[PDB]
Design a protein around this ligand. Structure first.
Ligand SMILES: CCCCCCCCCCC[C@@H](O)CC(=O)O[C@H]1[C@H](O)[C@@H](CO)O[C@H](OP(=O)(O)OP(=O)(O)OC[C@H]2O[C@@H](n3ccc(=O)[nH]c3=O)[C@H](O)[C@@H]2O)[C@@H]1NC(C)=O
Ligand SMILES: CCCCCCCCCCC[C@@H](O)CC(=O)O[C@H]1[C@H](O)[C@@H](CO)O[C@H](OP(=O)(O)OP(=O)(O)OC[C@H]2O[C@@H](n3ccc(=O)[nH]c3=O)[C@H](O)[C@@H]2O)[C@@H]1NC(C)=O
Ligand SMILES: CCCCCCCCCCC[C@@H](O)CC(=O)O[C@H]1[C@H](O)[C@@H](CO)O[C@H](OP(=O)(O)OP(=O)(O)OC[C@H]2O[C@@H](n3ccc(=O)[nH]c3=O)[C@H](O)[C@@H]2O)[C@@H]1NC(C)=O
Lengths: 262, 262, 262
């Protein structure tokens, strides 16, 4: 159903079955499929295609030439009714693509809230983007990539399939990420390597100096101690008992499958 | 003429003169020029621009915001009635651009069959893409580039004008290809360099172990022997008399103009 | 007002207040906002969005899926009535984005005349592009970037915020520019470094051999002398008294804020 207070441009094509929330705005030449849900106050500027089994939250701004919920690019995909979930207050810029999941990959592509996805950012099938992230122009995620809370992916940067980009990470522009990036880490290069802790990001986000110190110490255990990851895991866990922010490392390690960028 | 069984959306603009085949589907807000031929069963999803002297085959899927047959970006081009040919069963994704040829470059941009051209792939004037190729997101071909059968161009990768990407090549993501890549070769970097034979690709495509061995031996003659290309050409030709797959090298050498990546 | 000789496609949406000049052509499914001025003979092919406080000159060609005058991607922007200015005879290709300025950055994004902006080129808020420039496919300018007259930005190349790309510069494809590039310089790499003078560009543009020699000598003072920039500035200024072309360096130094690529 289309809410009585939603605006639907006469030139827009909203298929019967679509759910459009209160004070939503569907601009000129948009197409909205029958399995799409668009939340209260969400705006599709113009020339937006939303299809598939796709749920979009509240107060989103989706710009022209974006394609949301579209068939993914995995040759394994066969037309199964897979899904996209997008949260609230995202800014999804011109030409952004967010593709539906695959059954093989869990069936769901998910984007959280308060993210900025810049021009031609690509969120492939089975990706999970958290909250407060930034993907700069042309930032490209292959299938099954996680981008955790507050992580920033620089302009022109691509991420290899299955990789995890940890919370509060900053990946520099013109980079190629081939392995997992621990939380709080600055990454740059092709292929990307680690360049210390994202101190500036943590400062601005209200991290205490004790927490930043602890995180820096965890970083040093991983990259400067000369020990294996298996050796330092318990040390990092111990540190997390005093500084809860360090637990982010422990949680990340349990999800990591591709090894760490080094 | 538009076939009686073709669907043309009321909002689509198909110019008189366009040929649209049986069971083709022209989606909302598409524009199809008067010199365009669209084959049986081909689908233009929505918001597709097809113009120029452009022939498109059967069972193609062309996604929103793609531009096919458009004026090329060569400053030398002056509006001459040059051409685009696209074969059958291609998947041409969102924002892909395929531009018409130039008179200077032979007048034809050609794409074969069963290719996957991912989001914002660019096929410049006078390019020739073969069959079963993959161009990943933002893969960019400059003018007069050949991409031979089964070749894969990784995400964010660009190819310098006049370069030949050989059959069964795999070019890694985030690469810049400045010279010719022999068939069967793995290429990566900026500028791209060779990293052995695409053994996995050949395996999956049904190449015998004898053929793969012969190809590896040819690779070694080129890159490991320390001999010049002129010296090894006849040796490679001799090898091809037993293993026909090696002839791909010989055929490639005769087309190569920019030297080999090394 | 819309000039009596301008063409506006029945499917195009031109908002009352828009100014459209003589013999302009607004193609199918274009949207033109109420604060837009489009000059004599300018063509919007189809599916173009032009909005904001945006002035576009004469004889421009703007291709499908381009977005001109749109809200910029700076999180600092709050909806202020900032501006875009575009000059004459530009070729603005498919999916190009040119964003409005920010109050913080001076309020104006400016593009000159006779430029070629290739597919998915991005001109961020507060950028200044001069005349006769080329931005190749996916060339991406961050905020507040200057691209001076005749400068060429290669395919897939990104430029860090606040950087100045000097007059007659050639930046190679697949590059990342993190600092200022003096006029006449060839730049390449990630991050980009200098590779001598753009001799070929200068030749073609009618530079005398005496001027090219003087420019090469200035280049050598900067990069080969082993002296600091402060030391060579007066030497370069002295040289400019005989060869006026060298003054471009002096003018550039006064604008440069990020240091020189080295
Ligand atoms: C330096 C960083 C650069 C990163 C650049 C990333 C660009 C991403 C662009 C967005 C694409 C996205 O929308 C689609 C998605 O990534 O699909 C794929 C899907 O996520 C995956 C898993 O489900 O499966 C497919 O990719 P792969 O064919 O690479 O599968 P794989 O990762 O499981 O295969 C592993 C091995 O195949 C090897 N291989 C394959 C083919 C070949 O010819 N040669 C070869 O060696 C390759 O070396 C690799 O080690 C899928 N592809 C296709 C074409 O079907
Ligand atoms: C590390 C790999 C990075 C690859 C990045 C590739 C990005 C491609 C983006 C797609 C563009 C495509 O759609 C258009 C096509 O490539 O057009 C050109 C056309 O294929 C060509 C031949 O016909 O001619 C033109 O390109 P060039 O101006 O480079 O011609 P050229 O290759 O024959 O010139 C050779 C020499 O010119 C030199 N040059 C030119 C200008 C200058 O200011 N300085 C200079 O040195 C340059 O160094 C080079 O060695 C054409 N361009 C223009 C702007 O007219
Ligand atoms: C190798 C070259 C690669 C280049 C790649 C360029 C890709 C450009 C894509 C186009 C984007 C453009 O349309 C938008 C524009 O660039 O916006 C920004 C605006 O031009 C800027 C100044 O006004 O301010 C913002 O960028 P920054 O957040 O980087 O501001 P800054 O440059 O003043 O900050 C300086 C320091 O912040 C540091 N920082 C920030 C966050 C963080 O988590 N960690 C961190 O270290 C960072 O290291 C840097 O040294 C703006 N961004 C946002 C998201 O608001």
């Amino acid at each position: 159903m289309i809410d009585k207070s939603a605006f639907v441009h006469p030139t827009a094509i909203v298929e019967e079955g679509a759910s459009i929330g209160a004070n939503a705005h569907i601009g000129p030449f948009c197409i909205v499929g029958p399995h799409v849900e668009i939340g209260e106050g969400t705006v599709l500027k113009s020339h937006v295609v939303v299809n598939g089994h796709t749920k979009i939250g509240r107060d989103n701004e989706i710009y022209q030439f974006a394609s949301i919920g579209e068939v993914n690019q995995d040759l394994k995909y066969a037309g199964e009714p897979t899904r996209v979930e997008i949260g609230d207050r995202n800014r999804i810029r011109e030409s952004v693509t967010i593709h539906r999941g695959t059954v093989q990959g869990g069936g769901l592509t998910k984007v959280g809230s308060d993210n900025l996805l810049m021009i031609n950012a690509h969120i492939a099938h089975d990706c999970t983007v958290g909250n407060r992230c930034i993907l700069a122009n042309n930032a490209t995620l292959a299938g099954h990539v996680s981008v955790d809370d507050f992580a920033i992916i620089g302009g022109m940067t691509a991420v290899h399939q299955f990789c995890i980009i940890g919370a509060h990470v900053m990946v520099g522009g013109c980079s190629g990420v081939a392995q997992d990036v621990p939380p709080y880490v600055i990454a740059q290069g092709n292929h990307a390597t680690p360049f210390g802790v994202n101190i500036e990001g943590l400062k601005r986000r209200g991290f205490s100096r004790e927490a930043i110190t602890a995180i820096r110490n965890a970083y040093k255990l991983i990259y400067r101690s000369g020990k294996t990851l298996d050796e330092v895991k318990p040390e990092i866990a111990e540190l997390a008992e005093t500084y809860p922010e360090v637990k982010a490392f422990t949680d990340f390690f349990a999800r990591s499958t591709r090894g760490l960028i080094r």
